[PDB]
Symmetry: D2
Subunit: 492 residues, 4 copies
């Protein structure tokens, strides 16, 4: 019924009084200082991403420290995400640091370590030791962000493949390779990841963006790598190839959420199919009640230009229309010239799209897919959201300690803000990747367990009032316990 909703819209009508979508910002030289982070927060950042593909632990410690300091000074809660380097397939080195590959020419790719240092255009090293047994004749080898394409002709020997160069491209040392038609059987985490994941646990990071997730089993490996002390850290699986896409159901099941890495997917998969995979992955996550992130190549041109392209704007809006919880910035904030302006524009685009989005369509579609009998939690949350639509309530208040009930309510897409009142600061931070929720910390050790729920509900209603969401005479739908209890509250 989005079509019917479109008919009634006017672009000169006022936007909504809240932005549901959440913005993730990659931190770098442009943004690591406390003042720059404060600018980012004020601009609309909810999550600070650390890209562990670059920088040392000391560098990322500065990010961690500065984020917390910036957040404390503004009196907000900012999530900290550790995005892993992950397993990689790279070529070796070349003689003269270069190799001119030409269309029609024959070359030999080998997994023999002896050729790691002495590669040429004729024969060179690829560090993936299972390359030969995974590839068949006819398969393609992509090298250097998929620019150079090789086609496998035959097995020259156990370690060496005879290849045709399908297009002219010059490659340098240690370039990344992709196997578009092959199942890559590299482990879930690299040696570097294990060290980085333990550091993340020690430093109290909120979530892991786990690279190159290909199967459900690998999610559990990441979990093992985090250890017992890292059990409450969210694992967001980055979907980067056909295996991740094909195994999406079982991966979603095990994960705490999904990143749609469009650029990485686009190395192996045609761009038009990636648009569609984005649609599928987001909708599957919406149904699972798990956060989903739209990432890479969002407003890329705004890295060095003061404005992005028109197509980039439509990309951001359509991620929201698709149902994304979050939209992500990489180089635009990490190394960009206009970090504040890009985040501010991203927020503006999201808000505009949201105002056009018919939330009821999401609620109705998701409700109709539920199997009857529903469990108590599911019934309470869907009914609560239904009560919002039926009474035209102007806010929801959800008491949630772990964040579970808040995510379950957000899943059903009410057309008003959700205020989550929680007794855990880490819940405040982790809910920053869930659309349409804002969190209020209730310090139970300071103020009491509030067994009758009245103090926490009042904290919720008050926050909603301070934001202008509700006033005297408005309805507010309250849910508390997982979640098995609902009230329709008249605001005083």
């Amino acid at each position: 019924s989005q079509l019917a909703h479109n008919l009634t819209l006017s672009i000169f009508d006022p936007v909504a009084n809240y932005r549901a979508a959440r913005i993730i910002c990659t931190i770098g030289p442009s943004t690591q200082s406390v003042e720059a982070l404060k600018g980012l927060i004020q601009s609309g950042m909810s999550v600070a991403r650390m890209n562990f593909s670059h920088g040392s632990h000391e560098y990322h410690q500065t990010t961690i420290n500065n984020v917390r300091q910036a957040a404390a000074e503004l009196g907000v809660n900012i999530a900290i995400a550790l995005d892993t380097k992950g397993p990689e397939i790279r070529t070796g080195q070349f003689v003269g640091g270069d190799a001119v590959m030409e269309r029609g020419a024959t070359c030999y790719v080998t997994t023999d370590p002896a050729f790691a240092d002495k590669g040429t255009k004729d024969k060179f090293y690829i560090d993936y030791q299972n390359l030969s047994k995974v590839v068949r004749p006819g398969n393609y080898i992509y090298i250097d962000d998929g620019i150079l394409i090789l086609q496998v002709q035959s097995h020259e020997d156990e370690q060496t493949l005879e290849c045709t160069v399908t297009n002219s491209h010059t490659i340098s040392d240690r370039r990344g390779v992709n196997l578009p038609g092959c199942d890559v059987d590299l482990p879930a985490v690299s040696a570097k990841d294990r060290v980085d994941l333990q550091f993340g646990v020690e430093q109290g990071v909120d979530m892991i963006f786990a690279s190159f997730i290909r199967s459900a089993e690998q999610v559990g490996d990441v979990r093992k790598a985090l250890g017992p002390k890292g059990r409450d850290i969210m694992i967001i699986c980055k979907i980067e190839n056909h295996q991740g896409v094909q195994n999406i159901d079982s991966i979603i099941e095990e994960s705490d959420g999904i990143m749609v890495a469009r650029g990485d997917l686009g190395v192996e998969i045609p761009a038009e199919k990636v648009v569609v995979a984005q649609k599928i992955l987001i909708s599957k996550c919406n149904v699972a009640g798990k956060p989903v992130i739209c990432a890479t190549q969002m407003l890329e041109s705004m890295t060095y230009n003061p404005r992005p392209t028109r197509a980039e704007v439509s990309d951001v809006a359509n991620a929201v229309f698709n149902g994304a919880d979050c939209v992500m910035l990489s180089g635009e904030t990490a190394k960009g010239k206009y970090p504040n302006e890009v985040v501010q524009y991203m927020a503006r685009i999201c808000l505009e799209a949201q105002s056009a989005l018919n939330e009821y369509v999401f609620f109705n579609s998701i409700k109709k897919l539920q199997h009857i009998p529903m469990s108590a939690d599911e019934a309470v949350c869907s009914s609560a959201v239904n009560s919002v639509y039926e009474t035209k309530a102007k806010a929801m208040v959800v008491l949630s300690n772990t964040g579970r009930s808040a995510r379950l309510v957000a899943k059903y897409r009410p057309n008003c803000p959700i205020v989550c009142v929680t007794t855990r600061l880490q819940t405040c931070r982790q809910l920053n990747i869930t659309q349409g929720v804002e969190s209020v910390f209730f310090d139970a050790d300071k103020l009491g367990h509030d067994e009758g729920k009245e103090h926490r509900v009042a904290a919720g209603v008050e926050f909603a009032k301070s934001k202008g969401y509700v006033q005297t005479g408005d309805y507010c739908v309250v849910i508390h316990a997982y979640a098995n209890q609902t009230r329709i509250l008249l605001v005083e």
Copy 2:
């Protein structure tokens, strides 16, 4: 969707484990004793009806006292209803106590009091002083349960009408007359009614069955006759003629419920149209959320026969299918030979019909008619019933002091029993005219105020457990404070 439900049914499946419909019994010489009343209660009586058309105040006092004693000995709460004699139009007396009226003959009906004692076949008295100004030429006068029909030809004078006798019938003294095409402007209540109603209040009757209600204004007159001390007494308007049917919407709005008096309606309205009138009135009350009673000619032949006719059985079942809260027995229990058996059989027909009735059709139809935005009470009660269907809950517990929210929940027709927990014994009695509800009395003077609701909630759950409605691991939907709070409870 009753059609689809019919397809899945088997008459060899076991009946439901509860009966939703309620049975009202008229008390008389067959049934006035404490033992006969106990037999009635055990047989399925929820409401004792006193017909104030017959008997003295002392006689009805004995009914009141004996009902209370029988109910107390069985540990149940039974409603007491006062059915008013109502205003009446009667003929006067005749010379020789008889008048042979013949087809084709001319007679004269007069409102002159002089002819009250000396009526003949040629000229006789009718005590309705507004008869002449209300009737036009061509209108019919029905006399003696509509058996004798006269047609008005002209005004002989200000007090006398010239009539044709349309059919041969012999009438005796003081026979009741009907004016099928005329608006009868008799007061809402007679002097006897006003006297009887004050007696009702003194004796603490639960409800009035107010005879011959024709307009909304008239409901006010009953309320005023009940006075400040009778404010909590329900007024059930008896719809007996075309006027009550025409004015049904406004009457319902002012009343606490409706009785469809098929027999009386049938005097002036063709029987097939009364069947449809029954459908309309019941549905309107179902939507209004107010009790509706199907009464007169229910299992009439079982007054003196050990079994009813097959058509009588279908009549009762279809009353239930129509949506009636209550079915009513008159002579069958008042002066009948098989009072226990007729009630037991009525209960069995009702239970059978219910097992074939698709409650969801009622729920959905009524829900769809609700105006959006809904008020909090309406939204909470429909949502709670919806949750029953979604979780396949096996009971509802409703905390309701006045019975209001119990009736609001019952309106939406869950497919499980409703247990009302109330602090007022009169609420327990009054809810006996609401289908699908059983009341549990919680003695606040003896047990406390239960401000946390936990004791009353547990009492409700316990009652449901003792009746075998719920066991360990079943869901129970709990609703309480109007009612703005809901819980989905897992039964321990």
Copy 3:
């Protein structure tokens, strides 16, 4: 959505301009003459039933001849139904022609032929030779329209059962017996049936009402008994016991329609369960697109009284509300005092009920149960009816040679008349048991095959105009070929 429809009704609003339901009349002494049949036709008879339980072939030949003559003189088409005696279980004869059975007494029922002539209260004959092997201890034997009930205690021998008399009842010779808890394995047709069925084929009867149908296999036996020359005769299966009810799905599948014989069912099954079985059977037939007849005990009291009871009126109306194509009269027309008046009242009741009935509920419920993909026929007919509702067309015209397409359209319950134009007179007659259809004969041998369909469509539109169904500017939905072609026609 019948409930929603009830809210908008007024009993003082005009009835519909057509009666959809069809009336079947049993012919007898009261009605066999041509003039009485003409009276019956003019009163509302569409089908003349011949009860072959009584009367000789010569008697029924007079019925057949007189029906055709009466129909020809009024210029209408009247269906002729042969209702078979069917297989029966009877007791033998008694010494003195009588047997006084008393509660508590022991008696012996035997299948030994020697006791056929010499029965007593102690020991008597039952002609069902499989009685002993079909009955277990504890089972009941009903005798004399189920008035006398015996309980089987043990097998006295291979042919004799020891029985307790559960109630006092005096029985005479050759009384009918019932086995409520037993599968009766008597053949589908009796010896008498075979002779009667062949006579029916020779005389060109339109349909058989086949008695005591218990299983799907038996329908085929009736078909075999009709022979190759009787292949177009409709077999309507009379459902009279639990076996018929339990096997209803497979029976409907094989049959051309169903009679719900309430009185016969009521011998073995409690009356309240028969009400429900009526609901189930009718809805299952509505879904199968096969005619269903509500029969026995319809307005029985109008056999000798000038008016029926109020409950009888509600029974007739509720048969229509249930979805019956037809309602049937037995003794009311066969031997009754008021044959014309009873048929006229039956028509009036049906028309009143129909005016209150929400046809869209039937259409919608039936459409939603269709499996997708639908076949072409199903899609065309449902769409055609949908087009009636969407354009508010005032009539349908269906060209059907066998009647198949007309029944398929009628199944979907448009809220306007269906005019079937057919090239077969027998189709005109057979459609008289399908609700909401009227037939126009088009003599193709006289007027041409009308390959372009224009003459037949014009015949349809003209008939609709002559009845006042459509006028200039109204829409008419036309369907022709089974049926794969639709037109929405503007009436000139």
Copy 4:
């Protein structure tokens, strides 16, 4: 329910066997030759757009002639569109052909013709004579594709405005100006337009893309300029500013279709609001049943690059998801380096998006918005598309001479190809802007009138068979005469 559909998708499933969306290509020096036009057609061009902002009548004559020759050699019918230059507001000339405008500086814009040749940075000419009376103080003047922004301070005199230069930009002679907050009251069409439009009619163009449409009245002006001989030519209104968006409802009603000119809209409206405007306009046209074109900035970077950006790809796909009939290429085909490749890639994106698009959502949404009662044409066309879904038909055949009914069927979005059989070659060409339709020309002069429709029906079925849409035993939904007749045909 796009959400539910997304769940069932796999990007590794094969794409649909037809492309519904249509590709419009702008002709220029890269593409004007018969061979280049043939390459365009084979690549996926359905419509040749002539941009009358550039080139002479002789130049466009050559485009017209070459299009017809290329189409004839490939045996296809290609639409020819004349896109008007439209009315324009331009600045005058400058001394030295240049003017350096600086932030903070004051300048004077004048409508006095004397300054047309002698403009400077201080004072210069704007050819819109109503400039002063249309603009208020505070309004902005955009110049040179909205790069230079001026703010009006006051009226210096009747012809001169005092302006602040809000940003530094250097402008040259005759630059286009925009008035974002002002209603431009220029005539619908310029003198050139009126001349060009008469040329269009003489040369038999299929459609006009009318520039800068701001009101419904203006559509009339285009129609009048086309004259009596241009009555069958479609007018597609180009929505380019806030006025066209505001007045969209009345514009749609008067026009034959809409072009959403994102680039032009973007000069005065923020890009994120243009994305939403696109959603609104497309949905409104989908409901109106009129063609809608998504145009400007489609795959722009592919003008000089061999591949587009990832965001450009998503832009195209989302145009299709929005519901666009057509996507349009401008410079990419007019003067681009990869004209064949850009069209081929556009076709591939469109086909991919379509395979993910749930057509049923469109069908249902549009059907639900229809007013009941419906007219015959609307009812027949929605019902035919409904029948496609119900029978899972694999093609539709629509007989449509003017194309009206073809467009009406396409409006309801069946999930199979539509084959229009038409007797007019201009209908074949005009339907090229309607998604999901392929036209078959039936030469009535050479083949007959086909009064029975059988030849045209067979031609439609045959075409569908040759394209592999249907084979033996598939269903095909046939619709013809407006269109009031429907057939569900089993393919032989």
